[PDB]
Amino acid sequence: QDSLGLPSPGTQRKELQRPLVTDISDAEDIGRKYLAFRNSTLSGTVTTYGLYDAEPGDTIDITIDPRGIDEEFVIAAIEYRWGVDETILTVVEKRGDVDD
């Protein structure tokens, strides 16, 4: 509202139906889950080497000075590529594209 200068709050909305749900707290949770899983997030790739013992769900220190990053992150995905010798770390969250 404040950003765009809208007359009234900037509602963006979905309607869901879950007919077999009888309890209101479950319906709330479904709505909350819907909001949460598409709420804005840091994601993205850091390319390194090694880290064969690293699993998703693990934590790692990452320093990238040109990017202003000096944090401890959760690993969402690891990709190992021979030939090019790359370990690609997806941090915080992974989201698809057309797939999603």
Residues binding other proteins (CB under 8 A)? 1, 3-15, 24, 28, 32, 40, 44, 65-72
Q: Report yes or no: 84 and 93 within 8 Å, Cβ to Cβ.
A: no
Q: Which is nearer to other proteins, 56 or 69 (CB)?
A: 69
Closest approach of other proteins to the CB of residue 42, in Å: 10
Q: Which is nearer to other proteins, 6 or 77 (CB)?
A: 6
Q: Which is nearer to other proteins, 1 or 48 (CB)?
A: 1
**Helix ranges restricted to H, 11-100:** 24-36
CA distances from 55 to 35, 59, 64, 72, 73 (A): 27, 9, 21, 15, 13
Closest approach of other proteins to the CB of residue 10, in Å: 5
Taking alpha carbons only, the member of 65, 47, 58 closest to residue 92 is 58
Closest approach of other proteins to the CB of residue 66, in Å: 5
Q: Which is nearer to other proteins, 55 or 97 (CB)?
A: 97
